[PDB]
């Protein structure tokens, strides 16, 4: 039944899903070591650290394609939508916002929908690299990977923003799980746009998104 | 008597004022910890360290807008104007140059005129951001801020040039005075170009520069 | 006999010489401290470190001119040609590749031909900076210097890729040999294109290349 895959391809991410990626990335940024002190003792750095988690995919892919990184800061609807989630994650009265979404079922849903945002971001970079370089395979893999796990690759300079400098934990020395899956996804979808992979885009899009959501939900259930 | 603010608006910064900004920046760069040994034992580094103090506003705004940073190096008149001040601040015979402009009254005039350069640089970035993005308020604030206190934001990587690495002192962790005032100026003039702020550009221009000159003069008088 | 310089100017670098530059840079990158452990324990990082050694000139000249750094990743022939030399230098069975090219005569030819590729890279950026800026003297020197010793200038951030962070060893604090010669080459050829230097481009090209090959050969002979 390929009938359901094409219904899945008609999803729009502007309202609900973008907020899920913003919330999961910000909550994960808070749970990092010493992040709570940074917001309290320096809201500016914790906000800019959050923006690097939410828009690290767009910021990195813009630096690689020589596009203006401030261009990501133009969509005031998306920056405000993320900044509001940032304020409620750390500054909500009685910590009701974080304590609510830290609940296991809600954290699973939000984390699962961020993985859905990861797919279109990979395809967005692959098709966008196609508009700058046509059949350039390596360029499509790079920009697609950059939008999939941008925050994972700038993580060395994002840590510098909060004030932590760990020159030993590069993303190329030890590839973390989200960065290594994006690279696999960027490679698979690049083989799709080049027609070297025998499957429709809509079907490969669904099976990769399911294989991704199934893993993180498994990790989150086996962790608690 | 608004007949005085507009006579101030017609000022030109190319001869006198650019040099004052270049001089105050270089002199402030020399007074930093260890800058004297660097020039003597590494003139290339101390020169490149100074260029980030003089044109750091232009460099950062060029990186944020995906403009060529080497474009700042095209104006051979402005680069040579700042380089000669750099050579005379550190290498003049008998140190007559530094000891002359370190005298409290002259250092007040030079520092006060650099603050005037800060205003047009903020407005330069604000109007230049308007050319690339029409009514994007955040882009205008960022670029106008980047030109106002460029060297203050790249201060982390400017320290790396001379050899010092302090990951704990980010401009977003503890905002210094010149950087936080530029941000205040960038926000005000952005509300001006968007007509949310009920005052003419030239009156706001004059009252902001005066509020900026008066503070630094007061700081330098209460410091000595 | 200027008829020999004209024949030297007809050299094409796409087949043989590009590999030599890729070989000498990768081999020099392997002989660095702790580089063998990185490839074995992290092939992704040692590969990206090798790419910074081979295409560091094109990358830095691209960042300085606001050109897309991923644009260097479009020439799939050049990237694969360098990546193949990278895989053999580190993973060849019984280390036969490295042990072969480490032989002093072969290491002298490869390193000598890299010095030739250094020349065209200088004039490439000089003529490329001319395409963007007419008679801007400083821009031509910079981009010509960037392509000549790009890997040497990004050395600080290249060391960070492999995981070593030495903030005390900047290229502007103590200029190494290949970086200080490129700068001399960039200035000389910039005076050539500007016709301030009284010598034909072909002759200055040859005498500079010969002056370059003779030195590194002498260094490699007096070092063993």
UniProtKB/Swiss-Prot annotation, chains A, B, C:
Signal peptide: none annotated. GO terms for biological process: regulation of release of sequestered calcium ion into cytosol. The keyword Membrane applies. One of its GO terms (molecular function) is identical protein binding. A 1,2-diacyl-sn-glycero-3-phospho-(1D-myo-inositol-4,5-bisphosphate) binds at residues 114, 118. GO terms for cellular component: endoplasmic reticulum; endoplasmic reticulum membrane. It is a multi-pass membrane protein. Residues 30-41, 97-99, 155-175 are cytoplasmic. Intracellular monovalent cation channel required for maintenance of rapid intracellular calcium release. Acts as a potassium counter-ion channel that functions in synchronization with calcium release from intracellular stores. Activated by increased cytosolic Ca(2+) levels. Homotrimer; conformation seems to be controled by binding to diacylglycerol (DAG). This is Trimeric intracellular cation channel type B-B. It comes from Xenopus laevis. The chain holds residues 4 to 227 of 284 of the full protein.
């Amino acid at each position: 039944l390929s009938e359901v895959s094409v219904q899945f391809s008609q999803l729009s991410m502007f309202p609900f899903f973008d907020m899920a990626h913003y919330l999961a990335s910000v909550m994960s940024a808070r749970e990092q070591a010493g992040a709570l002190d940074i917001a309290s003792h320096s809201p500016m750095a914790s906000w800019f650290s959050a923006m690097l988690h939410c828009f690290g995919g767009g910021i990195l892919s813009s630096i690689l394609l020589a596009e203006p990184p401030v261009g990501i800061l133009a969509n005031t609807t998306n920056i405000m939508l993320a900044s509001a989630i940032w304020y409620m994650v750390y500054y909500f009265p009685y910590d009701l916002f974080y304590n609510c979404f830290f609940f296991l079922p809600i954290r699973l849903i939000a984390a699962g929908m961020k993985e859905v945002t990861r797919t279109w971001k990979i395809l967005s970079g692959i098709t966008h690299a196609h508009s700058h370089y046509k059949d350039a395979w390596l360029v499509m893999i790079t920009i697609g990977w950059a939008r999939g796990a941008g925050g994972g690759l700038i993580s060395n300079f994002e840590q510098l923003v909060r004030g932590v400098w760990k020159p030993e934990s590069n993303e190329f020395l030890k590839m973390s799980y989200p960065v290594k899956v994006t690279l696999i996804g960027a490679v698979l979808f690049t083989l799709q746009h080049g027609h070297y992979l025998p499957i429709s885009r809509h079907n490969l899009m669904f099976i990769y998104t399911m294989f991704l959501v199934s893993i993180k939900v498994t990790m989150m259930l086996t962790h608690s």
